[PDB]
Design a binder for this molecule. Structure first.
Ligand SMILES: NC(=O)c1ccc[n+]([C@@H]2O[C@H](COP(=O)([O-])OP(=O)(O)OC[C@H]3O[C@@H](n4cnc5c(N)ncnc54)[C@H](OP(=O)(O)O)[C@@H]3O)[C@@H](O)[C@H]2O)c1
Ligand SMILES: C[As](C)(=O)[O-]
Length: 315
């Protein structure tokens, strides 16, 4: 619909607003405009360094009575430096403070890789490599389940997990809460048919990130492919009298995925919301799928030898 049922009984808005790369000086206004426009789902993370400013916008709109809190669906993520059992509740409460909420709707493990705790988000050794924690996925999962029993979060999930890492949690002895959601990269150049089939067969909702190809990723190279400018995708958009961004947002929706485009620009935030009024045909869908080239925006290239690096497995 406009909302999908999670395995905890709550319903997640199929469209949300992303906030990675959203400057602290612009994001409060961006989230205020989104909520005005009809967004009810905001994707956040501590590592984005803008949760305080996101929270100012949420507070203003609650105070104004534009939305009730129970109508909002607010998501954040546990960063890699807080995977230790004793650091997890603390990371969560910090995010809750910044956002000025008393619970999250969904809390995700941001990446499966744990790093050494500290103030640096990517701790480097003297050789400049990332320092790993010796924690594993299962112990971090048990700390996350705690958060649900304490009332801090309603649902817990994972992000950038491959299918064997998901398996690992599902087979955990004494598993109390299943992951509700696996948030992964997904667009016409990285279609994820195998992992999406796997998660959906297990009752795990998939959220597509970087749906537009992340044209503002800080590592962008000029030779690099561009989804928004692909003439094949422009043609499908023209047929439907929509923009190529609106086609790229509608595509995961028809695959029963949640999608979270990022924008700090009021007219684009508005434009990105107008995707409930049209339908891609099944020929269009099959065509977009055929464009897959296994191209990833986010490959976490500094952690390619971490014991828990997710992207050595096929799916
Ligand atoms: N879990 C993870 O590891 C992870 C990783 C990456 C992303 N995500 C989440 O997914 C969100 C989305 O992915 P993303 O931020 O990489 O990129 P994206 O949503 O694929 O693209 C954002 C870029 O596209 C532009 N854009 C938005 N609407 C547009 C439109 N209608 N027409 C033209 N350009 C448009 C934005 O410009 P303006 O802002 O200038 O308007 C921004 O430059 C993130 O913000 C984050 O919340 C999660
Ligand atoms: C690309 As990210 C900052 O959501 O790990």
């Amino acid at each position: 619909a406009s909302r999908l049922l999670l395995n905890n009984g709550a319903k997640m808005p199929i469209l949300g607003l992303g906030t990675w790369k959203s400057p602290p000086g612009q994001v409060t206004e961006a989230v205020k405009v989104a909520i005005d426009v009809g967004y009810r789902h905001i994707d956040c993370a501590h590592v984005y360094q803008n949760e305080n400013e996101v929270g100012v916008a949420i507070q203003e709109k609650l105070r104004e009575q534009v939305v009730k809190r129970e109508e909002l669906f607010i998501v954040s993520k546990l960063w890699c430096t807080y995977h230790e059992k004793g650091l997890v509740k603390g990371a969560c409460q910090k995010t809750l403070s910044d956002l000025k909420l008393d619970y999250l709707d969904l809390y995700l493990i941001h990446w499966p890789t744990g790093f050494k705790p500290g103030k640096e988000f990517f701790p480097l050794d003297e050789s400049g490599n990332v320092v790993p924690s010796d924690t594993n996925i299962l112990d971090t999962w048990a700390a996350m389940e705690e958060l649900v029993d304490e009332g801090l979060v309603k649902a817990i999930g994972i992000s950038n997990f491959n299918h064997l890492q998901v398996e690992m949690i599902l087979n955990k002895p004494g598993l109390k809460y299943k992951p509700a959601v696996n948030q992964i990269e997904c667009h016409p150049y990285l279609t994820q048919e195998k992992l999406i089939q796997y998660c959906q067969s297990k009752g795990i909702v998939v959220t597509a990130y970087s749906p537009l190809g992340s044209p503002d990723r800080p590592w962008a190279k000029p030779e690099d492919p561009s989804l928004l400018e692909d003439p094949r995708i422009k043609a499908i958009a023209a047929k439907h009298n929509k923009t190529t961004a609106q086609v790229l947002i509608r595509f995961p929706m028809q695959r029963n995925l949640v999608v979270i485009p990022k924008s700090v620009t009021p007219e684009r935030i508005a434009e990105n919301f107008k995707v409930f009024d049209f339908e891609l045909s099944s020929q269009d869908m099959t065509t977009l799928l055929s464009y897959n080239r296994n191209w990833r925006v986010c490959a976490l290239l500094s952690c390619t030898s971490h014991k828990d690096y997710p992207f050595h497995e096929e799916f």
